[PDB]
Amino acid sequence: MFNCLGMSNRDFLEGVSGATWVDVVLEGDSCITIMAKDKPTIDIKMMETEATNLAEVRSYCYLATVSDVSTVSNCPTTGEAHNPKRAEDTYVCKSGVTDRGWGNGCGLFGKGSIDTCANFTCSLKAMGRMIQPENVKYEVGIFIHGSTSSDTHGNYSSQLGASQAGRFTITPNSPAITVKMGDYGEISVECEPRNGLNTEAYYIMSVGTKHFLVHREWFNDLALPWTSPASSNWRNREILLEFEEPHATKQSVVALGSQEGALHQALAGAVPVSFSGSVKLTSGHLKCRVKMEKLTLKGTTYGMCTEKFSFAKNPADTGHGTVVLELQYTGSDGPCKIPISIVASLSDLTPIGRMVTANPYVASSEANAKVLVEMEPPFGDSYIVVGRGDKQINHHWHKAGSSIGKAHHHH
Amino acid sequence: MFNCLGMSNRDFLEGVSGATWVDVVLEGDSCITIMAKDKPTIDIKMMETEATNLAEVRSYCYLATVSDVSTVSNCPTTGEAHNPKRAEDTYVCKSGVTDRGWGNGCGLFGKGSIDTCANFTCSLKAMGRMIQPENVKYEVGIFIHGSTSSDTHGNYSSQLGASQAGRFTITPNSPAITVKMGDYGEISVECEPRNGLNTEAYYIMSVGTKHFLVHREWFNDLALPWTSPASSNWRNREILLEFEEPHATKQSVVALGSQEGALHQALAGAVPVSFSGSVKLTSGHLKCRVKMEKLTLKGTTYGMCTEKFSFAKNPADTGHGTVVLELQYTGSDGPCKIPISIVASLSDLTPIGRMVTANPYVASSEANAKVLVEMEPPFGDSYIVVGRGDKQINHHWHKAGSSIGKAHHHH
């Protein structure tokens, strides 16, 4: 979707009289319709958020195995013990003093030395990757409620071609942007990413079959053996190793148990992510100020359409307290403004309610044009009326509800 | 090998005065010579460890492919979507709600339903098998250092026939055993398998061309799709599947990437094994207590041999600080005890050193018998002397080393 219509995850905001900005929250899967006095209605929504060229920060080991454990030992006065496995970098080595005597095969009594080494291999590891702010693009779609039909309204190519839709990019570095709006002037947008979209606060951690957005502080403080992205030999290998109390000529080295369970429990709350090479960020939101003082209706204005209309599609409930319909216009006098309104009584034509599709018009000079119109009728019974006199058509509508005030369940 | 001689992987233990047991570690490829006061010297070693009738525990999938992905979709009020592929068990199916409207071909606006299915096939799997304790035999060989020759010493048939060798089985269920020792009384042996021989701690995992001894806890916690040995349809197939965000009438289903690399890295430390139908366990060891209070020299004792000896084989270094030789006896007065000793000087015949082949004797009544003798000479110069007076033969020996104490490199 590049527009608000048809979406269930949709909100409506008002640009009230005199307001020069509207504050919005843009989620990955939602859409905002903004209606404002003497301005075209506009939709704004997040289209996509992608981050390219993730860089490794560090990898941690959460299950180690030990192998090839050996101890070199020397009786007192016979020199210090050195384990030759000290040459091989995958071995962790530990020097020690031992009590020696006749009983343990040494002629003299006193301190002997030992040097025990053991081969370190990581069984299970988790990688952390980071996102550079210069490699993040937040794609935002804008739609202007100009003339559309049921066929053209959700067609991006058609809307882009009528200068009624477009796509702009917001970045962590360039969070402000002025977007031209065809014949409607321009808007200015400034956003701040929050939660899952504030990539400065997180790393992507790959564990097992999954990838997770994880808080940087927690990842950095993980007390596990680790490797740098370059020069990969495990550091702090001693965590997960237990050098047991040594005997005179031998020493046992055992791996600690797996920390995988503790890891999974740490990741239970975290948002899973997919394909960390060009990751798609779904969670979180942008907090944006849409400045609209230069958003304007079109300088070229029209007269009213004079010929007759019919309902090409009868009013339908959108689920949002609004109704949408499609008119077909017989006249060839376009472009022209559509004489459509909502009234309480066919005997009293005072307009009530509100048009979502503000200033509806036929765009085409050709006959039989189709125009979609979305409107908010009042609570109770009303009539959608198009035209006047003996060209008038109308359709009754009933909207459930009251003005007392809606309960909400915000998430 | 059923005996210690000729092996490089050999250790010597002492049954000291008053000790009623000796504690030993039996590895798959090593041998222990035990010398003890007023007892025959004995060898003890692991002969084989085999496990029969392994049973499958579970199999895991570490690379899945998806195929025949399809979605059935329904507009609002038109009923719930059901995918008929829900009948076929190899399909994973996922129900969903979608936003519907004119734009996506539905007359009414509201929630439509979808039902997407996809065929699951495992590309690469690993099987885990378990060993019942009742199907494990640890075979242990015992040799008594009775009279032998260079020809008979390593001949099992000859040694079994002289009641100087035998083979007994230790099992996880029956880890204790009393073994008769011919005319030497008996010993009692009790063992505990450790590491690679403690089959209660492991499963055999078949991956690719290889089989590995793997820790049970790690295998059981593997978060991959799995099948029971019976009723084989994959469970937890959803791991390795990604149902992508659905469009109105379509939904993409993709397999996750292979977990083979993570698997190989998990198996890098593990001990490889061969032929898991009757697997041979090589790695690990038995920790055994050899009780020897009823081990005894033979009740039938001999006088000294009176006739002359010659060296059929000159003393040879075994590599263990011991020397082995072969005498040939001219006399027909056997069986008789051999008058052999180690001395510092031919002018002073005080015995020094130690006989590995304790109480050497000629077993045969026939002439020209050959008797192997292994002995530990002191550091420095010494003489091996056989016989007395003008029947005396001797051979000088030099042993490098000192009594200060040997450095060791235990593994």
Numbering used by the authors:
A (entry chain A), B (entry chain A): 0 to 410
Q: What did the paper state?
A:
Usutu virus (USUV) is a mosquito-born flavivirus that can infect multiple avian and mammalian species. The viral surface envelope (E) protein functions to initiate the viral infection by recognizing cellular receptors and mediating the subsequent membrane fusion, and is therefore a key virulence factor involved in the pathogenesis of USUV. In mature virions, E protein assembles, in a “head-to-tail” mode, into pre-fusion dimers, shedding the fusion peptide from premature exposure.
In this study, we reported the atomic crystal structure of USUV-E in its pre-fusion state. To gain insight into the structural features of USUV-E, the ecto-domain region of the protein spanning amino acids F1-A406 was first engineered to include a C-terminal 6xHis tag and then expressed in E. coli. Via crystallization screening, crystals of USUV-E that can diffract to 2.0 Å were successfully obtained via the hanging-drop vapor-diffusion method. Within the crystallographic asymmetric unit, a single USUV-E molecule was present, and clear electron densities were successfully traced for USUV-E amino acids F1-R406 as well as for four terminal His residues of the fusion tag. As expected, USUV-E also folds into three domains (DI, DII, and DIII), showing an extended and a β-dominated structure. In this dimer form, the highly hydrophobic fusion loop is readily concealed from the bulk solvent by the DIII domain of the other molecule. While the DI and DIII domains could be well aligned, an astonishing oriental difference was observed for the DII domain such that it connects to DI in a more extended manner in USUV-E and therefore leads to an obviously enlarged inter-domain angle. We therefore believe the enlarged domain-angle between DI and DII in USUV-E is an intrinsic structural feature of this viral protein.
